[PDB]
Design an enzyme around this catalytic site. Sequence first.
Site, PDB file in Angstrom:
ATOM      1  CB  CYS A   1      -0.794  -0.159   1.245  1.00  0.00           C
ATOM      2  SG  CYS A   1      -1.397  -1.705   1.978  1.00  0.00           S
TER       3      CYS A   1
ATOM      4  CG  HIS B   1      -6.233   0.908  -0.861  1.00  0.00           C
ATOM      5  ND1 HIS B   1      -5.233   1.652  -1.155  1.00  0.00           N
ATOM      6  CD2 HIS B   1      -6.077  -0.155   0.150  1.00  0.00           C
ATOM      7  CE1 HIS B   1      -4.225   1.397  -0.431  1.00  0.00           C
ATOM      8  NE2 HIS B   1      -4.783   0.351   0.250  1.00  0.00           N
TER       9      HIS B   1
ATOM     10  CB  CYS C   1      -1.629   1.507   7.258  1.00  0.00           C
ATOM     11  SG  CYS C   1      -3.356   0.949   6.535  1.00  0.00           S
TER      12      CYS C   1
ATOM     13  N   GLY D   1       0.333  -2.894   4.343  1.00  0.00           N
ATOM     14  CA  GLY D   1       0.535  -4.462   4.656  1.00  0.00           C
ATOM     15  C   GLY D   1       1.753  -5.119   4.965  1.00  0.00           C
TER      16      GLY D   1
END
Lengths: 395, 394, 395, 395
Positions: free
Chosen positions: C90, C351, C381, C383
């Site tokens: 991300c 996203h 954030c 992963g």
Amino acid sequence: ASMKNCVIVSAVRTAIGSFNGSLASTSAIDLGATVIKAAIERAKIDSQHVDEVIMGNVLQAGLGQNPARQALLKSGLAETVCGFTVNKVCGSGLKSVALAAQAIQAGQAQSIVAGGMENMSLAPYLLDAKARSGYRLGDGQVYDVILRDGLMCATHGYHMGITAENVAKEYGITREMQDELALHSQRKAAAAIESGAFTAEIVPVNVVTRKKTFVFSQDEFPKANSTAEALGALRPAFDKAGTVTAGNASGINDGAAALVIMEESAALAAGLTPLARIKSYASGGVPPALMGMGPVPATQKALQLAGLQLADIDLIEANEAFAAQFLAVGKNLGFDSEKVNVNGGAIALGHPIGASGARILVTLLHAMQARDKTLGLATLCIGGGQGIAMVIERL
Amino acid sequence: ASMKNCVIVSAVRTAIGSFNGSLASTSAIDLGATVIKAAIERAKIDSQHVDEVIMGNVLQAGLGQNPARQALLKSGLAETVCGFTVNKVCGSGLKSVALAAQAIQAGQAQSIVAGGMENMSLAPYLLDAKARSGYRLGDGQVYDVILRDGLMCATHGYHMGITAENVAKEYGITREMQDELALHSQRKAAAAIESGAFTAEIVPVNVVTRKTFVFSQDEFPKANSTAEALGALRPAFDKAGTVTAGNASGINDGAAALVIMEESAALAAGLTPLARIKSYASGGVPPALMGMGPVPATQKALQLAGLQLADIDLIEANEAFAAQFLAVGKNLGFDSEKVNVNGGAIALGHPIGASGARILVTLLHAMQARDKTLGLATLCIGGGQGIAMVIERL
Amino acid sequence: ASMKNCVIVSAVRTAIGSFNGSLASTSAIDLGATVIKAAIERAKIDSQHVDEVIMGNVLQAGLGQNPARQALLKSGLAETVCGFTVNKVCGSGLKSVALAAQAIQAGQAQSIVAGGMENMSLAPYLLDAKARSGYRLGDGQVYDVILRDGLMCATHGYHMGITAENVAKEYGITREMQDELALHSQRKAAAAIESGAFTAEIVPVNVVTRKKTFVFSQDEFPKANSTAEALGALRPAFDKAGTVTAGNASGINDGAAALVIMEESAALAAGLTPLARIKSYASGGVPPALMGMGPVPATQKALQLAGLQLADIDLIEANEAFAAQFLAVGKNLGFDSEKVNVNGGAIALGHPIGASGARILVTLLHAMQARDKTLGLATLCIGGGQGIAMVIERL
Amino acid sequence: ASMKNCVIVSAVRTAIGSFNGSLASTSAIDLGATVIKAAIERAKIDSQHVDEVIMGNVLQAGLGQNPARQALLKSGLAETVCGFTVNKVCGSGLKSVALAAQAIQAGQAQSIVAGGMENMSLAPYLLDAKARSGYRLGDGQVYDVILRDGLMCATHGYHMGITAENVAKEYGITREMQDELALHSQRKAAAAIESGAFTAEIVPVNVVTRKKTFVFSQDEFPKANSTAEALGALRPAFDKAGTVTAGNASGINDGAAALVIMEESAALAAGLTPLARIKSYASGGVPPALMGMGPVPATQKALQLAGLQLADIDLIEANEAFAAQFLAVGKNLGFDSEKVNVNGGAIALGHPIGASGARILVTLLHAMQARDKTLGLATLCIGGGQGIAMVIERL
């Protein structure tokens, strides 16, 4: 021992679904279970008196051990009831009924459910031959099972549609002849649907998905407002220089059909009503390249075994896998066109391969009843160069 | 019309190959074509007088339209000769013969070649319907066809070996009893091979790869099997179970075929009937206990023949799993000395769609060798069935 | 040698497509080429003066050698222009921009296009290594790359959504809190769309298929049918006893974004207009199980490196992968909720994982311009238990 | 701010495995973890004073979220340590080190572990991207990820080997020239192995499988008793009329390599021993069809940034993906052959694509130490038409 007589006590089919259509989420085995149960119900037989279930099914890949036995179990029949699955390609569903009749005539059984089932929408893919030992390095293939096991010639490696081109050329069946036949089939099917001619023979299927629930009870392949002009404008489906199109060939389709067959004295003693006697049946072989001519020797043999001439037959169901072969068969045998596929045929209705042979028999019986006719013939061509035929006599 | 008598005029089989062994590059259909042609030759029938070919085949996936018909064409029979493929799982090869006999008895044919064929080594891998209509989101699976269409129960989703565990528990068939039976089978098979007892029934197969050689000897038997080696094997299907690789058959390749004929027609043609088919039957049992299928099938077959079990001189009862072989024996009351006299599938292998015909071929030859009169061939069938046939030597 | 200042000279993104939606036939690399070219055009730089292209892309499987380099070539840049592809899940699209800034600050380049690209609709399925060495006997799995390389935790083997449940439990973030936040995002997004707030930052994409020919220019993930009632009625998506639903998490989405980054003196000498100076950036690590808290350390560090307190920041873009983590981060850092995601966030907007980090940065800068604000923070954030943050100062 | 100096503090690699060889059951990420841990141990740094891990990895398909971060976690580094994964194809492993040096020179980090990792043996296969919406009807393909993402040109659709033929033609590099070079590489590698020259740089890998358990510590790709005659007899691999064979090209291979890179004054204050200073680095772009010439502009730029001429360099590692391109690069730059690949190169040693760029840097550093040389150059070509280069100074 002397031979016994065999009778049909019930006959039923699903409506035929289109490819990725209304039955596309309903397994072949569940379609088979549906028609087995419905045929039992309609016969009014004691379901504990069924001796065997025989079902046609061509695309067996990935369906699990012995689809016929799964279908009989899913229908609710007891574990003591034997069954097996038959693959004679497009002839599978009629071959199953012929084997049932033979077992009964031979004194080996008294009551059998037979038919066929196919879900082509759910057919799988195969990995290439290297997958078990390893691809190692380099791209591979995935093979469509419809094509591999159902619609391509194992002898010649080309589509059934190419065998139809061969027949068209060999018997002088033109694109215009094929399109006129197709439009005739479309028109007869539409009129049969609209008049309720299929109501009696069709068992509805409840279809449930995340998106929707609905009941499927009307054949959905037919093409509304078909015209000679629209047909003449289609491109050939298998060969650019050919005659066979999506409009003059049947489809890829999903469906099932089944019949209760019983030894005649036993049906009568049980207070049941025989609908027809199975008079004869036969298979025939021809060159694979000309598979569409299968019905010719099958029919000749069947008629001989019945002690009849073709003209004695009141109604004929001759499958329309391709107009080209339908016409060539009719020309070779001298079919009276007014007696054939009186409610339309596969070009309009569809061709769920392992069910079609039983499907046409179901349609034949019900059409004989509607028209109070005595003698009927069901016949169809078989990939790999075969045909099968059956003659029935109304009671 | 009156029913006719049916006789066997020839009986032949390939040697049985191991998984990835000698027949692993020879298609089921080619193995079928081999045995069809050999059966025709050995019968000394005019090959233009064959009315139909009926062949068992379980793992049909990717084999192409109607495997029996391809096999008959590859054998050299004329395009006018009809054929079809039978799937009654493990019963398919015997079922084909039963259907041939029935057609003959019913006056629908005079001469049929019937049997079965399987190449389990060449069974494909499969992507399910989601490959066709789309996986959409989330994982799927790739399926070994051996398992999916052959060796896993479609009703319960567990292996045939688990049905064998069920049977072992239900009928009190212990690990030790299973291993004793396996060793007996290995010993009898080794002695049969060593004495030439399979020589008459086996048609050699020419194998060309790479590798050029002739396959003529069953290659699944495990040399120098011992009670100690067997007792140490780990269970194959359940860590707390009794069934192992040493007390179960294998994954195997092979084929078998017989010429079946109406009796007067064989005699009129100057041929020599080898045996009359006296009766046949199928039976159904729970899928969880499928290994018990032979019990009802045999009961029915014997009753149809007007016989008691003791009247039978020799028996071939397939050994898919020692557990079910033994439970079947106990429920029928088999005389163990009359059964599988040349060894069975634990030693010889289990090419599923062929095995039913394979045992029939082995039975007949063993009856000839021992000058016996009555024989029974029976086997269990995945999905909860059995099939049995009784034959009488002429 | 002295460090140099880095400025943003242009910033652009595609509209964000829905899964199987408007961009589902446009490859990630073609989306990347579109934004690279547009960012170059909007910057008014000489395109022969681009020193590198750096693009985030998470689902690289099957896309071919070095997606970034394919995108730069497809955008029309010369073969002498280098590029490389970044995978920080991300964070990839923001990381690309941080790397570009660092290269410029370090005197290694003067002009770089950076961003990210993702087409999740087109992500493939995979057979694992057993296909190469051989299945031998027994079954295998066919893996969805979205899940395997994008949305499932490699450390714990469960979905990112489960990490969101972990965070909800650890920081006391209730279902109701999550749904309130989701509705707020949907409402801010709808109002931003309607008022034209995303017009300046979006580059339209032409889409041509057999079925449709059209121009995609408006974010299509936002759910008009959003109400507290509809959100409260959704079933949990990842744990039957949980809080996280499709309504309070972002989606699977397709899109790209890019920015031209330059050394400040060089931009000025070229007559170009700096839009903002990159003041600092940083990455942080946290437990994979609590990966949604990544922004906390990343933001703390970025603020320290900029010599700022959180209250000095005028506008914040904090990605909304899951309401649960968005809220937990905000509570921990003490975000002024009126400064955050003023035009809505990923719950509404989507996203596209390798693009999102660049996407939020684009959105941030345009929102700062619209509101004449001086200091901005972008954070998200990541992963696997990371976070990334960047502070920018308008010029 | 002022720029800082960056030093290498440790350098380590695995031995290189052959395709389906000794490392074929050890995931890329586990190989990466092994070299990360070893590089940290050899540097003598506090085992958690790492600011970031940066790893090259080309075949990321199916390996899970951000392979670099998985690898750092598996190595035992704390969850607070960030990481990312780089894809600049063959250049990935050297690009990672360059980025680490840049972050340190920029003052953004003090200690970074960088390198690359690849397991080509375990690369997966891909379904056609249409599998998600369905193959529908007709045969399809399954794609080798090594070829799709690693070894085939995304611009031209042909193998890297064909780019090598393009370079052989363009620069007049004959089959005989290629085979002489290959035999030379085989001989140098055999002598280096036999003399222990790789012992210091290699970290052994324990391999444990159901079948076999052993320690892998010696490069296994070298072909013992190579001869001019055996090489001259090989068939071309990629074109029947071509020059490139299995004997004059590198392999498909497995391996990993990593280095600890630190800010210089801080390494010293910590009592550590710098092994070399990273003096410069650069990347270059060339036509994808001529990708093997990448090292030319990369090396020219790297030398210019270091303030050096080629002749100042004492030892050179120039990757041998294909003899054809190795030789063309050398001719173009005027390499002193005696200074290049003194312990053999990739034709003998192997080419684990995402690791190789770090692998050669490791070999270069150790060879400089062994021969007490001052200036080294590492460079390699990159699929898609790039090159990367680094200059190091002992210390």
